[PDB]
C-alpha cells in the first residue's frame, strides 16, 4: 500500500548528521521494510557493528542481521551516517499526458534545490501526487507558471483536473499511498467541458 | 483579421496545458445569456519573454476577484478551435465596464 522506491534509488554514500543531500530525502522504515532488493543491497554494503540512520528509525546491519527498528521522525539523525534516496526516477516512458479530475490540492512539499510537491485528493482519499522544480527535470521551465495555479487552487479550495507526466516518478512524500509524477497543467473543470 | 471584444464577462474555466513543446492556458467567459467565449495564448517565440507569465498571472488575478472582464479574441478559421486572446481588462470591482 506504499509506493516503494526501487534499488537504483539509493545513495552510494550516506549522509552525515542526518542532513541528507539536496534532491535527496531520508528513507522511512516502511519503504525499506517491504522492499527485498533494498534490504539485500544494504546488507551487501554494510559491514561490522554499525547502525545507520533512516527517516523514522535505525538500520542495524552487519552482525546485527540487518534489522530495521522503528523510531520517532528525526529522532536518530544524530548518528554518523544517514541513508538517503534520490527523490526522482527516470522511468524512460515517452511524452504521454494522463489526467485525474475533480481533485483538490493538499499536503504541499518543499525542499532545498529540489521540487515543490502537492497531493491531489478526491472524496478525501488521495488520488495522485505531483511535483515541479525550477532546477532539474524536463519540466523545469514549467515551474514559473504551474505554481501560480497551484497556489490559487490551494487557497481557494477549488476542484480541478490535474495533468501528470510519468516520464519522472518522484519519491518525495513519505509512506505515500499515492504515486507522484511531474505536474504538467491544472484545469478548472466544468463537468464535461472541452478545456478539461 | 476578425477580432471580437467581449465585455462584462466573467471567467469560470481556466486551464493550464502543454501544447506539444510549448504552453497554453485557455479561459472561458460567461455572460447572462450570451454564448460562452473560449480563448487562449501560446508561446510562439516567447520562450525567453515574460509576456505569457504576466498575462497568466493577470488572468489568475481576474479569476480570483470574480470581476467582469473585457477580452479581445482572434478566432480560428476552423470551427471547434478556441481562439487566441490578445488583450485582457479587469472591469471595476463590484461594477460593470462602460
Amino acid at each position, epitope marked *: 500500500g506504499i509506493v516503494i522506491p526501487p534499488q537504483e534509488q539509493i545513495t552510494q554514500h550516506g549522509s552525515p548528521y542526518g542532513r541528507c543531500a539536496n534532491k535527496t530525502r531520508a528513507l522511512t522504515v516502511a519503504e525499506l521494510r517491504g522492499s527485498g532488493d533494498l534490504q539485500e543491497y544494504l546488507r551487501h554494503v554494510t559491514r561490522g557493528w554499525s547502525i545507520f540512520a533512516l527517516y523514522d528509525g535505525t538500520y542495524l546491519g552487519g552482525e546485527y542481521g540487518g534489522v530495521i527498528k522503528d523510531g520517532t521522525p528525526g529522532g536518530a539523525f544524530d548518528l554518523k551516517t544517514t541513508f538517503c534516496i534520490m527523490t526522482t526516477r527516470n522511468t524512460g516512458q515517452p511524452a504521454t499526458d*494522463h*489526467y*485525474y*479530475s*475533480n481533485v483538490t490540492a493538499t499536503r504541499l512539499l518543499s525542499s532545498t534545490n529540489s521540487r515543490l510537491c502537492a497531493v491531489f485528493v*478526491r*472524496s478525501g482519499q488521495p*488520488v495522485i501526487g505531483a511535483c515541479t522544480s525550477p532546477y532539474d527535470g524536463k519540466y523545469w521551465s514549467m515551474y514559473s507558471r504551474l505554481r501560480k495555479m497551484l497556489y490559487l487552487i490551494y487557497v481557494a479550495g477549488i476542484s480541478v483536473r490535474v495533468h501528470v507526466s510519468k516520464e519522472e516518478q518522484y519519491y518525495d512524500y513519505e509512506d505515500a499511498t499515492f504515486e507522484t509524477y511531474a505536474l504538467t497543467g491544472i484545469s478548472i473543470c466544468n*463537468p464535461g467541458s472541452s478545456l478539461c | 483579421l476578425p477580432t471580437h471584444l467581449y465585455k462584462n464577462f466573467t471567467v469560470q474555466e481556466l486551464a493550464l496545458k502543454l501544447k*506539444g513543446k510549448n504552453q497554453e492556458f485557455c479561459l472561458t467567459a460567461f455572460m447572462s445569456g450570451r454564448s460562452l467565449v473560449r480563448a487562449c495564448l501560446s508561446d510562439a517565440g516567447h520562450e525567453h519573454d515574460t509576456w505569457f507569465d504576466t498575462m497568466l498571472g493577470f488572468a489568475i488575478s481576474a479569476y480570483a476577484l470574480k470581476s467582469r472582464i473585457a477580452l479581445t479574441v482572434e478566432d480560428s478559421p476552423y470551427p471547434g478551435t478556441p481562439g487566441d486572446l490578445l488583450e485582457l481588462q479587469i472591469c471595476p470591482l463590484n461594477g460593470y465596464c462602460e
Partner: antibody
Amino acid sequence: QITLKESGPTLVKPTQTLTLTCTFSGFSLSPDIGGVGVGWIRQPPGKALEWLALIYWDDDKRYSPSLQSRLTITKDTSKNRVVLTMINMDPVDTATYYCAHRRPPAYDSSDGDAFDIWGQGTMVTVSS
Amino acid sequence: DIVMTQSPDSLAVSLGERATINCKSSQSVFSSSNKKNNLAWYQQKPGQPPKLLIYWASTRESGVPVRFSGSGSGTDFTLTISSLQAEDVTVYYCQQYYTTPYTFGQGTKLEIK
C-alpha cells in the same frame, strides 16, 4: 462529428489475412490527448456482439484473451488510422466489423467510457 | 473476465405498459476511484450500428428520449422505457467496461403482440 469508416476487402479466402482500417474524422489518437481509444467489434449475421482489440493513445494494445494469439492492432497517428490484421481466417467469421470511439473517462484516464460513436460496419465473407 | 447473463430471451410487449430489460454481471462492475457502476446499454436498430443509451447504470447520454431510463447496483441492472414508441422494438445489449476483456450481452429483441 466523430466518425470512423472501416475500409477493407470484403471477400477473404480461408487461411489468409484480412486488413481493415478505421480512418477517423473528429479525434486524434496522439499521446498528447488522453482518454481516447479505438476498438474493433464484430457481429455475425444473427448472433451477439463481439470485442476484438483496443488501441489507446499511449500505444497500449489490449486483446481478447481467446484471440490475442492471432490479433495485431496498430495505429498510425500521423496517417490517423487504426489497422487490424487477422491471420488464419476461418469460417466462424463472416461477421460485420465496426470501429468505435472509446470516449475519455469522466474523471481519470485509467477508467473506461463506453463506445459512443461507432462505424457503420463492413461485410467480410470467408468461403472457398 | 466479466460475463453478462441478460435474463429474458425476449419479452413480448404492447405499445402500452413500459418495457423491462434485465441485465446481470458476474462479479462486480463497481469502481472505487470513481464510485460509478460500469454498464452501457445499447439499442441495435437492425441494419445500422448499435447506439449508446446509459452510462453508470443510470445516466442517459444525450438526445436519447427521456423515455429510456436505467437503474442498478451490484449484480443486477435494468433498463426501462417510459412509453413504448414505434422505433423501440429492436435488440438491446449490455456492456461492462470495468476490466478490458470487454464483454457484451447476448441481446434481447422487443416484440409486439
